[PDB]
Design a protein around this nucleic acid. Sequence first.
RNA 1: UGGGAGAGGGUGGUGGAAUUCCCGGAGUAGCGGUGAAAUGCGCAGAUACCGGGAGGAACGCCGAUGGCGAAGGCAGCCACCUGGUCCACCCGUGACGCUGAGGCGCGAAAGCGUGGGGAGCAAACCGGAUUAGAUACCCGGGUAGUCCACGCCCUAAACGAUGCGCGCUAGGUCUCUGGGUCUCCUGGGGGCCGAAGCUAACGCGUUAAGCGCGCCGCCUGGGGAGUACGGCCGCAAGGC
Lengths: 155, 119, 73
Amino acid sequence: ARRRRAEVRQLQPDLVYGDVLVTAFINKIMRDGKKNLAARIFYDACKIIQEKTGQEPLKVFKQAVENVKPRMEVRSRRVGGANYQVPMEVSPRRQQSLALRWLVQAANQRPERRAAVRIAHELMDAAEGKGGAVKKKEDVERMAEANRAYAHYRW
Amino acid sequence: KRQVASGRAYIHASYNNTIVTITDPDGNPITWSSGGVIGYKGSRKGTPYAAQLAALDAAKKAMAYGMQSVDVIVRGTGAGREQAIRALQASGLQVKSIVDDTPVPHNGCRPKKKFRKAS
Amino acid sequence: PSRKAKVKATLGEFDLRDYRNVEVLKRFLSETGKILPRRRTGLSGKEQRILAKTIKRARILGLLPFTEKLVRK
RNA sequence: UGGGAGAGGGUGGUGGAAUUCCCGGAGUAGCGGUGAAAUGCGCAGAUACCGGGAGGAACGCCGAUGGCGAAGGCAGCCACCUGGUCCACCCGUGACGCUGAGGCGCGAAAGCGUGGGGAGCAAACCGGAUUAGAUACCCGGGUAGUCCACGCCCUAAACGAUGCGCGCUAGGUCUCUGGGUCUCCUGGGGGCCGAAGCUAACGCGUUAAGCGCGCCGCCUGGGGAGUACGGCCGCAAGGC
Ligand SMILES: [K+]
Ligand SMILES: [K+]
Ligand SMILES: [Mg+2]
Ligand SMILES: [Mg+2]
Ligand SMILES: [Mg+2]
Ligand SMILES: [Mg+2]
Ligand SMILES: [Mg+2]
Ligand SMILES: [Mg+2]
Ligand SMILES: [Mg+2]
Ligand SMILES: [Mg+2]
Ligand SMILES: [Mg+2]
Ligand SMILES: [Mg+2]
Ligand SMILES: [Mg+2]
Ligand SMILES: [Mg+2]
Ligand SMILES: [Mg+2]
Ligand SMILES: [Mg+2]
Ligand SMILES: [Mg+2]
Ligand SMILES: [Mg+2]
Ligand SMILES: [Mg+2]
Ligand SMILES: [Mg+2]
Ligand SMILES: [Mg+2]
Ligand SMILES: [Mg+2]
Ligand SMILES: [Mg+2]
Ligand SMILES: [Mg+2]
Ligand SMILES: [Mg+2]
Ligand SMILES: [Mg+2]
Ligand SMILES: [Mg+2]
Ligand SMILES: [Mg+2]
Ligand SMILES: [Mg+2]
Ligand SMILES: [Mg+2]
Ligand SMILES: [Mg+2]
Ligand SMILES: [Mg+2]
């Protein structure tokens, strides 16, 4: 993006929730272009968040996400030869991107054999406040701010 | 312990550190801090954040004597002078007035090479 | 910019050689005991040069200051 | 004769800011330093703050794109001693002028004698770093020296890299100093742009490299070489 400012492509609303944030997560769950396979995993997991919880998946989803959105992170920079981790805020678009990605990544790191389960189980632990997705998040934040001595390098 | 209520706050900014000395209404020091007194051990001492803490530390230490207001005296130029001030204005302590009093010779001693080639 | 009125403009008939007239000379020193530059005092090369000689004399007598404290920063 | 502007020079005196040191108070763990550090300093209490002393050196703002001087070069303030120079009047001498081999004097910094003084800075040196090494650049110390008196040395990018003097050849603009019928004229300086013209160009252009006259000094391809030798000069280093 040396020229213009790149336009964030708009996604197709969910066919089961008319939600774009879902399709987004579904795409991240997606492997080698096989979307059908992906979609299933999600819904199948939504049905599992249905049984094991009176709350509707869509709601568990949102919350799970919301908790894993980092609000601060440390990006590098060169000064005097040494490298400094400059703590800077995190734009909305990126917060989301890191969230959904982190979930799926944390999910597939889980011990349960069935995919749809891991996505369901990670999603739950998420909204709950626990889970490695959130651990990754809290860590990015610990990292950031924990360098407040270099914050005077406003990006 | 002695109770003072009002006093002086001398911020001494440098490019290597920022020390702070809180004194009674007529110069005698009550408490003090610096980038060293607090954690930072090195070049970190000069950073503005360091300045902020040193300010707060000294500020806090001071209130443990009653100090409620202070007159500020700034000396020197440094990557962390304004922050020390801002820190004291927020340290609960009342900042009666800020005043620079950085020493400057009316041209006298020959500076080290590190500062010449000037003019 | 520098247009809050020239120092000479405000004063009236004064003796630039009177090193005791602190009330007037006072007008030519900045917020600090520093001698204001022509672009501010509004004097002429010849006058400003005379003023300076005077201001300095005053300082020796204790009438005027060599330096003052800034009150902000 | 009357009037003027100057860091022009010499001597004495004197003021305040800052650095260092010492004394005292108050305070307590660090200060310092760098790209990052370490050497270094600190509980025998440093750094930071306040008060008092001692000492040396240099004068902030004004300060300019400014002024003075034959150059070197010259700024805190006061007094004394002293050189140059500009303008007005148009009053005296009556060509008494210009240049100037040699000579004599002056001559930044460093350096050299003898004697002082040494706060800060700082060749050498002693150390810490950096580096492949680091006889450096960066950091901590530090002697000569830097300051003064007296005597030497006499060099330089001592530069406008432009020898003095005089006369002549559009103007515009800014500026420092005088005089005036103080829009603007006149004179002496300092800059910028430019007529004619000049210049290999770059550029110069009433402050000439322009147009001319007088006198001095220099140059004659590069290296060898500012060397050798010989003279002068110097205490020496070395200079011509
Ligand atoms: K010696
Ligand atoms: K031509
Ligand atoms: Mg498929
Ligand atoms: Mg003089
Ligand atoms: Mg030790
Ligand atoms: Mg002890
Ligand atoms: Mg003292
Ligand atoms: Mg002494
Ligand atoms: Mg002159
Ligand atoms: Mg010169
Ligand atoms: Mg006559
Ligand atoms: Mg006659
Ligand atoms: Mg000489
Ligand atoms: Mg000398
Ligand atoms: Mg000597
Ligand atoms: Mg030193
Ligand atoms: Mg190398
Ligand atoms: Mg080595
Ligand atoms: Mg050194
Ligand atoms: Mg020159
Ligand atoms: Mg000649
Ligand atoms: Mg002109
Ligand atoms: Mg002229
Ligand atoms: Mg003129
Ligand atoms: Mg022409
Ligand atoms: Mg021209
Ligand atoms: Mg001529
Ligand atoms: Mg020529
Ligand atoms: Mg010759
Ligand atoms: Mg030859
Ligand atoms: Mg030679
Ligand atoms: Mg030689």
